Design a protein around this nucleic acid. Sequence first.
RNA 1: ACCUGUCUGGUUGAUUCCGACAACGCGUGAGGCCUGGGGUGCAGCAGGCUGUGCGACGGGCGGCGGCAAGCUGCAGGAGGGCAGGCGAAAACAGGUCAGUGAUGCCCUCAGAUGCUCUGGGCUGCACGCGCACUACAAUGGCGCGGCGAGCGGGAGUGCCGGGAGGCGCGGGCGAGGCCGUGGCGCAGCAGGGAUGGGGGCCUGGAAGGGUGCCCUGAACGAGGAAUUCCUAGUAGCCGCGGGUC
Lengths: 139, 72, 186, 55, 99, 144, 127
Amino acid sequence: MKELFMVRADALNEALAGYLKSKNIVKLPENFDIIKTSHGKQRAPSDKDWYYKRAASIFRKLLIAMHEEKRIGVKRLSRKYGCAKNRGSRPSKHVDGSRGHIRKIMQDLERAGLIVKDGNYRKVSDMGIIETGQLISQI
Amino acid sequence: EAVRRSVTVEADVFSKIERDVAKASLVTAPSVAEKFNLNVGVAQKILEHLCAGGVLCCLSRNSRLRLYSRAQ
Amino acid sequence: LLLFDKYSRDEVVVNDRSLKNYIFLRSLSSYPHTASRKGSRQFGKGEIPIEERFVCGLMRRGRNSGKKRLAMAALRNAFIIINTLTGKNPLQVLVDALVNCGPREDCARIGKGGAMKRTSVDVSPLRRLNVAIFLVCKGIRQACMKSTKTIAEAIADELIAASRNSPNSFGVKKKDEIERMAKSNR
Amino acid sequence: QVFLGEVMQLYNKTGPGGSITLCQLKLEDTGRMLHRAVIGPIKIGDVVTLLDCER
Amino acid sequence: SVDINLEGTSVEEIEKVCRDFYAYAKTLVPDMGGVKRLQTKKGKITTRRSPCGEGTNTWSRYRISVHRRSFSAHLYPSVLEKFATFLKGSNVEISLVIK
Amino acid sequence: LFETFTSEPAQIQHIIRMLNTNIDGSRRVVHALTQIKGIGKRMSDAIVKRTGVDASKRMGALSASELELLQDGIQNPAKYGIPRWMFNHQFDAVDGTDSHLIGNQIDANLRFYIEKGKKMKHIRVCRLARGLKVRGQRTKSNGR
Amino acid sequence: EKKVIAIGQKKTAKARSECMEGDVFSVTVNNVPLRLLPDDMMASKLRDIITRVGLKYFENLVFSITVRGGGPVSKIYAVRQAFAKSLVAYYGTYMDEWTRQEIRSNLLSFDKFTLVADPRRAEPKKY
RNA sequence: ACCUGUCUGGUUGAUUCCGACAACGCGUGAGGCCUGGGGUGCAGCAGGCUGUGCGACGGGCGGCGGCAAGCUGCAGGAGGGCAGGCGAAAACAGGUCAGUGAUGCCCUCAGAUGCUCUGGGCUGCACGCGCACUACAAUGGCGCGGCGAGCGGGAGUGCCGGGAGGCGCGGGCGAGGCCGUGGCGCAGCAGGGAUGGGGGCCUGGAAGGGUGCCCUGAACGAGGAAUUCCUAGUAGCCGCGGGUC
């Protein structure tokens, strides 16, 4: 997927996140407005639509892992969404992301048919390939 | 010395700083916050508002600093 | 080739014959960052560009150690405010800051015997440039620490006030403070 | 008034630290050759600025 | 399908082993693969020198490194046995996988 | 151009009296609400998001209508859909009902805590009655 | 058809480059085109090489640069060395050689590390 | 007794060498050496791997010194004092009897100075001191998006949960940060995270241990006399992994 990269990365993200919100294919949890998103974070995310903006970021990470011909799970994906925890007087150690909402945000990407599992790894499917193709045609 | 710069606009500084930024060549958001007693947070959105009007053209859009100069 | 894609290094006139050897104005990169091994050859501080010598003076006081990308981004901003406040080439206003802040004569203690006498000492051109960099990077940092001034403004504040000699700039009121101690002992 | 001085000869690093060296200094238009103590790093072929107004 | 795997800590011994084995393998087969050398699996132990706390932080680093060599072919099991009899005068550890 | 200027409010009360606390109108509502003893930077993000007042408004600029939308949001946060695990004083020792202590309630709980412990000869409040460090901390070198 | 591979590297950042006789000049470093690089210092350190050599030598040459390892800034000098090394290796293979000597002399006088590796590695002290 | 050898001088990191010399010849140490690091020749094989070599000697050139040793600048060059390793003779009443099935001697051996179990202590605290950690913030902090190392190469996965964590399969990993951007905006303030309260967990037989959530939010606004470390991919900043477990 060479044409994935030939548009701007963050400009892809709200175009992707606004797609997942408009098509209603990712569903909000009950406590979405108060999730720390890691145990290293100090506040909840300030953005009201942070949940979609992450769903665009996760689906982009599965897109590039398919471009690298590599399989990615939820636990390895949380490491990409971890920050460095202010541990008080101790040195600030890197901690992992919150796995719980990442698992549900990928299950909604299975319901839309974007992400189809291959063995024990979920992979991007042809439906995810096509629907990105109209998006990056428009960016 | 404790300073807490006013987070308000009193309808007399806004035309005062609009006359002031029309005077100067280049102004930045912390500079009006020191020359006047404004928070630089409200001073940031004023100069974006004077960029929305035909008062000053946007120079550099960076998160560290947003620079503004007079139009034409 | 132009600095920051905007400013030409070629049309920068260092008027001082003393510092013309050491202020490096040969266009080698659009950015200040050239990771060259010029410190090893014992005089190559006059071979890395003056803006790279300047941004290395910024990244100071421990917490900013080595943050050159932060400094030259905060100089990329600092040259736009300078150029649109003055019209001059911001490299030309930078070299005019350092020739107006390097102390030409200094006070030091010299004695071959056990008794040492404080005497006036002439300053080398490369030392004159080294401590011109040091005095303005102190005044930039100390004026932007616990105030509403940013790093990108305090560069623009000091280097403008250093280029037109005035007691506001921290460099020349420390340069003249140094040279007064030379006349204090001679 | 400041007089610029070109260094032809370097000898005798002195002082406590050894930074200060005595350098035989040429003036441009006159040619008058004078020793002078210079603190920083110096090379033969540099030009130094003197402001002592006495020598 | 034979996988001749051999591991050794001494390198001047394990190079004499692969040399005489390749002198033995070219007598057998010309489709024999060349000797492939896998990653030298190396390990270090860092240890305080003093048996007490009187000295400076004097740390002695001891290292072990085992060198691996491999051979791959598809031969007859009687040839595998005469290969096996050949590599028992060698102190290199020998293990074989027939898959 | 003041009238076409919209974003930041013209007149703001400098301090607001609420729940026996003074909260500065200069701060924005999530940062202003944390001056209340018992409301931190995480709980105030929860209260403003659940109630629905604008976080981008300075707190003194708030009307009395949305201000009473915040004080009941503080008093019973379980009404405003806030989960149990984000509470100050949850799973109580006597009543056993999850709650969130605000203002003078914490110290009156804390004054009750040392008072009930000194009656029962509790060691942990006995060191706290003498100001000694009572957790796993070391007390030879530091805390002097 | 025509394709060369040359590698340049900083501290532990290694960078391959592949130069081909494509339709139009393009530099897609790490599968990302040069105009859409998020790091502008990555882009400008490529662009001043094009400014030094001049755009006429990059007429039809497509550079698909990949980089791995190292940090942010050592990745800049990894590809900057690898971009110039693959440029001169294309002229040495597929074009006339006296221009390649003309180009190499242009770059070596410009900056030494554009075409040769910086031997300066992370050399850690002991305790 | 001792001295010369083992030195007037020059030189070297080196008692390294040049040289003059009642000394001449040797030997340890130094060097040579061994390991890693960069450059590429060949060979073999498949975040590429490991064999074999080459490559630098201060060689060339200029100037000093000239039986000179050498020093110094430049060119060439991937490289012109790279980082380690072994490390002489003599010492010291240096430390270790608490590493030892290494041990002399002295003392103890049944109400034991033996072993083992349980509990407590080694973590007590008006105080003095060493080394570090985190800071005092705007060159910052917080929230998202983007890009992201090496040593070490075993581990991810699916599901539940807000987090910690849990469960079931199971050949299998990557950081602070930086960039972009939103908020705060000089405030003991969204700096700082000490102390304390309530809840959830992990390990273990056992929490004073660790972790997670909420809340409380201390001193500290640049630190006296003093004093440490450091010359280039170094100091510093910044994490990561391993030993312990």
